[PDB]
Design an enzyme around this catalytic site. Structure first.
Site, PDB file in Angstrom:
ATOM      1  N   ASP C  93      13.725  -6.919  -2.371  1.00  0.00           N
ATOM      2  CA  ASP C  93      13.519  -5.876  -1.148  1.00  0.00           C
ATOM      3  C   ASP C  93      14.519  -4.596  -1.586  1.00  0.00           C
ATOM      4  O   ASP C  93      13.907  -3.335  -1.333  1.00  0.00           O
ATOM      5  CB  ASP C  93      14.024  -6.335   0.112  1.00  0.00           C
ATOM      6  N   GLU C 286      10.446  28.456   3.025  1.00  0.00           N
ATOM      7  CA  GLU C 286      10.363  28.667   4.172  1.00  0.00           C
ATOM      8  C   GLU C 286      10.417  27.292   5.279  1.00  0.00           C
ATOM      9  O   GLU C 286      10.433  27.476   6.387  1.00  0.00           O
ATOM     10  CB  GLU C 286       8.637  29.119   4.507  1.00  0.00           C
TER      11      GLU C 286
HETATM   12  C1  LIG Z   1      11.761 -13.127  -1.590  1.00  0.00           C
HETATM   13  C2  LIG Z   1      11.016 -12.292  -2.451  1.00  0.00           C
HETATM   14  O1  LIG Z   1      11.895 -11.554  -3.228  1.00  0.00           O
HETATM   15  C3  LIG Z   1      12.588 -12.548  -0.272  1.00  0.00           C
HETATM   16  C4  LIG Z   1      13.422 -11.692  -0.875  1.00  0.00           C
HETATM   17  C5  LIG Z   1      14.761 -11.513   0.119  1.00  0.00           C
HETATM   18  N1  LIG Z   1      14.261 -10.779   1.207  1.00  0.00           N
HETATM   19  C6  LIG Z   1      15.724 -10.695  -0.805  1.00  0.00           C
HETATM   20  O2  LIG Z   1      15.593  -9.354  -0.674  1.00  0.00           O
HETATM   21  O3  LIG Z   1      16.726 -11.175  -1.184  1.00  0.00           O
END
Ligand SMILES: *[C@](*)(CO)CC[C@H](N)C(=O)O
Ligand SMILES: *[C@](*)(CO)CC[C@H](N)C(=O)O
Ligand SMILES: *[C@](*)(CO)CC[C@H](N)C(=O)O
Ligand SMILES: *[C@](*)(CO)CC[C@H](N)C(=O)O
Lengths: 324, 324, 324, 324
Positions: C93, C286
């Site tokens: 993420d 602008e």
């Molecule tokens: C699984 C896919 O990478 C979930 C990832 C987590 N949300 C994270 O970012 O650690």
């Protein structure tokens, strides 16, 4: 649960190598269908599956006569009340060929899903297990009916008429750049995005249940200095059609034009496609032969072979290419 | 102002049709270089331009012997102190072949920029005017030096070694899916993103000064039922090399294998590429011939021809394919 | 064998679920680094690996203060003679944010490779094992030096400055549409394609080893009816910079411009980026605020935050955005 | 010939600048609808056209109150026997928002075609003329009926539900990476590829007659260190819904979770989308709010606003998101 038949033909999804790190140069079509099924028991929760070994070869060796038998067998299975869908394991190299053939010849709205894998079953992070699971989910879903033949791999559902292997060695190789995917499978759920706007399956005029082989069609590449002798060779060996994987929008050199002229004089149907990978080859009355619409060379050959079992009329064949 | 020579060879950028609505089936290589320059007067504000008519043909007819002369002429021009860069107008269909040829044979860090257009100069919203202006801007920017040959069109700068025409008929056809663009041009400013990590121009061993012909190399397609006779035909006509636009990662059918073994026995160099469009064809000691790395069929043929002017040793040729 | 340190921070690559079919909504950062290493022992044949548990969290919770400490630890590690490279496991993420931060702050040419996985370690066809094997291969290759921070996943090597998660849940989510990949890994072999034409690591002025906190920078979206109150809120909460994920090329509505003007009047530095996903936000005399070049919102915030630790001069910050 | 109304709202297709080289920072919505028609008289050979100046603004200033009037006027127009279709000129920045809104509120199967341009009318190689011609051809073609609202530009026909501006300033910016195009326009001929598999126009329940405004919905970005106070601010200003352009698959940080819980307690409907650009945000019982299926933030906001005109029930709104 839905009754799904897994008809195995070979491929990397059924391939193996001495080590888990060998992802290339392995042996395709080495494992049996039941071995694939047993490797992913979870499928039994998606459907009552039955494995049938149609063949076990690397798809580069798949031939029209065998693809023909494959379509006839799938038609037999789909005619049965105890079969709700069919998943076909196949090598990735020519799956677009085999899939498009059945796309045009299967006389049923029941799901026909080709599945493949880019890494052998023995490989670290092998993609085959999940691709198979997804294929069975798609084949058994009531919402998957009447969508034409599909190719499932890497969480994507592609139409046999558009999907093509775009990369020599990546997991995400199957894509339809301009047409997108019919749907995707995420979190064990299917998301249908498109319905192809072309004729197929139950609305196709191509029935080959009474045939054992198809008209011969070869593919000639287009490039700087392309030789006229390759056209001569094809004609002399009895082709009924020639698909030209042409430069740009099926553009032809003076040498290619001479070769095509000879082909036409011999009754050979010339179909101009493109080597580029995507797009429309438009009509051009100033050039010889017909045009392949958005069909790539591999797809164009398949449709031309089937077109020739019905007619030799160029106008009719051209219309087939704009509607299938 | 930098001194830029605009070397015209033809193509759609110099193409025309009777109406502004005709964008296909037009006459390529119809307009003179000074007509293109005067069609976009703005180029004169970016540089001291000199138009030179090298040729005026549709690129589907561009041949190796002519490309050879093009490279030698460009080399000649860039050796002059009164020339800072060159812009070469060329048809889109085979610009990737000609561009990669010069990429390997022009011994200069001065910019060599191929430019093209997908719509004729007479078309509504023709792209040639802006493509040309962008090409001249890139050729005249000192930050453009030592980047290898480039192909400029649709606000993008692609490396001759990676760029290819991926769509038969769209304006945005030139892409390098896995490699991206060297840079982009937006709002009259050049944004350089990458430098290719391969040998080219001043670091290339491919000296073609004085040559008047190149080794014959043909391309054979890979697909279901691919015929062995095509290999026989190529061999019979004395090809020095065969580039295989193979299924998947250069996979070969039993017929293709037999044909390749025959070619090798006759001393022909076999180079396995892919028909997919992108990716790596990896080494595989279990298969005949050499592998094309990430070079597609069109690019592979060019490098093989040039390789054969220096050696027939497969090991040396293979190294070239992993470094150029 | 090279000495590679695997610095773990968490993520799906260390994720776990109760079933092998659950690929979504799993627990990220549940497994320890040694469990990852022993699960893919093949890494031991590519290098002498040493695992270090930096943290174990889901990347959506990664914070600048923590990334600052990660950068500092990596700098410490690479300053050691017995360390040849580092592999950093991280959630997908926000890996593009952490990767680009170190891309700008790590003062070493030794490889720094972030690796991640889109499927938990417990899922069928989990991608983490291969991704890790590939990351170690890259981190230990002598050819990998001086390329900037890299993100390895799905056989691809992306530059921290260009790569971004383009899809919410697919294995092939990481891509740099306009810039391509620095390289790819196929058949256990690395194919380097590009070298980023931007400043980074050893050539970066962004040294933060003496910091424990970073300037506050928030990101506000651009869309129809976007509210002026969001700008008022950010200003009131002491932001030093605002990154605008704007409509098109950082275009601003009458309300957004009022918001930006209030921010500028209040001493905040405004950076106009884009919500589109790719491309150049060009200079525009602008419109108020600076422009993000080709940096997307997430990357823009990282660079703006680091720029603010060195200056508040608009011109200086703007030049950073065109060179980093 | 078909009777087509060209309803102008502004945008770059009606943009103007002092020189032909200025393609950025120009004045959008500066030219009248009749000026656009007179510049491309070829349209009159495709249909009997009538220009109607609805507005002349930059789309970054297009607002829901105005979009409501646009939808109501188009419904009024298509109800007429003498109107076969409507082409709407609109700025590129928010055309995906306006188009998707009408896609959900226009109760007619007659073609609704939004058209735009990335280069001003005064620019060299301006795309507006061809884009308009193509839009008129699509709007007047019998085969175009019942396909949902479309966006036509750069020879492509995209569905309002999938198409989005992916690049800040390129001509080929509009794409639907995973869903592809509904069709393409090459050589003055339309090639239809897909039919979207979603509810729209004549099958939509979103009746907005009588409405003068829409429920307030704001969009908050997801990124490292995202602030809780932006949720507090949104709640304070009475938003009825919040679309979260989240990290990855709508993942939420501890601060985001806190802010979402506060909003939910206040009766605000929270919709989790993604900042990535593509893909599915799957359901997750462990996270607050609803999920956006494959709708990006801008599209999600539009559907959420319309969803709130019918109900505040989360279950129903979620179904809308899986079907529209
Ligand atoms: C699984 C896919 O990478 C979930 C990832 C987590 N949300 C994270 O970012 O650690
Ligand atoms: C493994 C990747 O699919 C190799 C596939 C075979 N060449 C085949 O096509 O069966
Ligand atoms: C116009 C689009 O480039 C046609 C090009 C010719 N076929 C050529 O390659 O010159
Ligand atoms: C010209 C490219 O479309 C600028 C567009 C305006 N920002 C608009 O959205 O109208």
């Amino acid at each position: 649960l839905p009754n799904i038949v897994i008809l195995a033909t070979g491929g990397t999804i059924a391939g193996s190598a001495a080590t888990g790190t060998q992802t290339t140069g392995y042996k395709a079509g080495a494992l049996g269908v039941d071995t694939l099924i047993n490797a992913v028991p979870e499928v039994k929760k998606l459907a009552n599956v039955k494995g049938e070994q149609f063949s076990n070869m690397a798809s580069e060796n798949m031939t029209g006569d065998v693809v023909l038998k494959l379509s006839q067998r799938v038609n037999e299975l789909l005619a049965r009340d105890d079969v709700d869908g069919v998943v076909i394991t196949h090598g990735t190299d020519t799956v677009e060929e085999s899939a498009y053939f059945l796309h045009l010849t299967v006389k049923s709205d029941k799901p026909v899903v080709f599945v493949a894998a880019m890494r052998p079953a023995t490989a670290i992070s092998a993609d085959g297990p999940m691709n198979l699971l997804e294929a069975v989910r798609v084949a058994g879903d009531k919402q998957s009916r009447g969508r034409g033949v599909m190719v499932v791999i890497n969480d994507r559902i592609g139409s046999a008429r558009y999907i093509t292997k775009t990369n020599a060695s990546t997991l995400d190789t199957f894509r339809a750049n301009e047409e997108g995917y019919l749907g995707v499978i995420i979190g064990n759920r299917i998301y249908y995005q498109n319905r192809i706007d072309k004729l197929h399956t139950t609305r196709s005029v191509f029935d080959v249940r009474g045939l054992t082989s198809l008209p011969k069609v070869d593919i000639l590449y287009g490039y700087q200095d392309d030789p006229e002798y390759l056209y001569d060779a094809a004609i002399q060996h009895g082709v009924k059609g020639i698909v030209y994987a042409g430069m740009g929008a099926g553009s032809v050199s003076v040498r290619g034009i001479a070769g095509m002229r000879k082909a036409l004089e011999k009754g050979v149907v010339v179909m101009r496609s493109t080597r580029t990978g995507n797009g429309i080859v438009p009509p051009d009355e100033e050039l010889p032969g017909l045009v392949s619409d958005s069909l790539n060379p591999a797809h164009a050959r398949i449709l031309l072979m089937l077109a020739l079992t019905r007619t030799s009329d160029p106008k009719v064949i051209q219309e087939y290419f704009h509607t299938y």
